[PDB]
Design a protein around this ligand. Structure first.
Ligand SMILES: Oc1ccc2cc(-c3noc4cc(O)ccc34)ccc2c1
Ligand SMILES: Oc1ccc2cc(-c3noc4cc(O)ccc34)ccc2c1
Lengths: 227, 9, 223, 9
């Protein structure tokens, strides 16, 4: 299975586009969090299916599969957010019928901070001209490299290695310099830290919200949160 | 919920 | 300033190891929190001098220097720790005479988890056989990547270029140079995560009164 | 104090 064929299977693993079915209208504090949690919940379902389509994922023990997703679900959502917003400076395209500015994130306390982290990192990927195929590998790497740590474990590293090798290949095909190729790989990988940082901040904020019973936490998003 | 989706299609 | 000169400069800028003695008696919740915090406080002082020696750091606006350091101080401390513990599987060498065991992390609620990540990530570095020169570059990238703004980007590329030059000087195939670069950098996330759990824990321990949080250590904790 | 160490020393 060459790097090219592995990337193709990730493309085929891409989840479907989601909409929250909200008639276009101004966002208030209740409707905004309501929309974000309702969408995160729908996407979580598709994330599980997406993960099982990554060659070898289903061959991991159930403990690993569960632990890897409980660990990275928020990062994969944000990484998907950044890809979709890449072509729209200033905006965060959570969904076609759920688009937010920085000013809209002001109505809700603690959110403007998170949006800024997401906008800055989206902006960063935008100046590097993140390519779709790169997006695919990176998003996969987030899943496989999320949680901190024999038969199953070796398969993970083997699987993570495979995706790493797929990202190198994609960069190799851009035809750029070898120095430029190495510089691009590092610039893309260094952003994983930023995605993880916003993730920790978003769950912290989401968790506080749950405790206040201000958001309609849905079954799936709920256990992914508690985990 | 997470586990049942992991084991079904 | 060639990559090699940047490496050579980072090697000289390495701060001296802070010597702290392990308490006489077997650790208690407090004696451990006071050891760790005392050591961290002293190391922060050296870290700030260290950062001012990173080529071009002092050329950034004061505000950026403050944001980088407040954002990465714990990661840098942990990366230093992991490197000092690299040739001692199972152990975390916080200092020459303060060699904590994984089990000693029980006399403190919730610190074992943080210790496990550190040990986990350390083993990964051990497995990759991290080299002194790679380590110097990585630690500096942590600080420059916690991210005048354009001057920080060229600073990060400068260090990235150095890490790339160091790995290339190992002789592994070009393909394997890329793979090693990737494998080393993927670990940055883990360090950032541990930093997050570690700082949240620390702030918690401060609210509990379990240990006095010094002036500099408190500023950094709050950011 | 952080600002002091960065600029004062
Ligand atoms: O595709 C998606 C769907 C939902 C998402 C929610 C957040 C988010 N960041 O910070 C928060 C804080 C909250 O209280 C609720 C949600 C969030 C970030 C990225 C997302 C991407
Ligand atoms: O060189 C150093 C010095 C102090 C350090 C403290 C922690 C640490 N991890 O989790 C914590 C929780 C606390 O409450 C206090 C300190 C910590 C981790 C790495 C370190 C490296």
């Amino acid at each position: 299975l060459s790097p090219e064929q592995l990337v193709l299977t990730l493309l085929e693993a891409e989840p479907p586009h989601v909409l929250i079915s909200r008639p276009s209208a101004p966002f208030t504090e209740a409707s905004m969090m309501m929309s974000l949690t309702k969408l995160a919940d729908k996407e979580l379902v598709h994330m599980i299916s997406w993960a099982k389509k990554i060659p070898g994922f289903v061959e991991l023990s159930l403990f690993d599969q569960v632990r890897l997703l409980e660990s990275c679900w928020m990062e994969v959502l944000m990484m998907g957010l950044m890809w979709r917003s890449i072509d729209h400076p200033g905006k965060l395209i959570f969904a076609p019928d759920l688009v937010l500015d920085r000013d809209e994130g002001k109505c809700v306390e603690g959110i403007l901070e998170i949006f800024d982290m997401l906008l800055a990192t989206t902006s960063r990927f935008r100046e590097l001209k993140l390519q779709h195929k790169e997006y695919l590998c990176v998003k996969a790497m987030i899943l496989l490299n999320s949680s901190m740590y024999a038969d199953s474990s070796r398969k993970l590293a083997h699987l993570l290695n495979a995706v790493t090798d797929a990202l190198v290949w994609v960069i190799a095909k851009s035809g750029i310099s070898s120095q430029q190729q190495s510089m691009r790989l590092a610039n893309l990988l260094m952003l994983l830290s930023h995605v993880r940082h916003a993730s920790n901040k978003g769950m912290e904020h989401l968790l506080n919200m749950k405790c206040k019973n201000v958001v309609p936490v849905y079954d799936l998003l709920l256990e992914m949160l508690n985990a | 919920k997470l586990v049942q989706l992991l084991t079904t299609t």
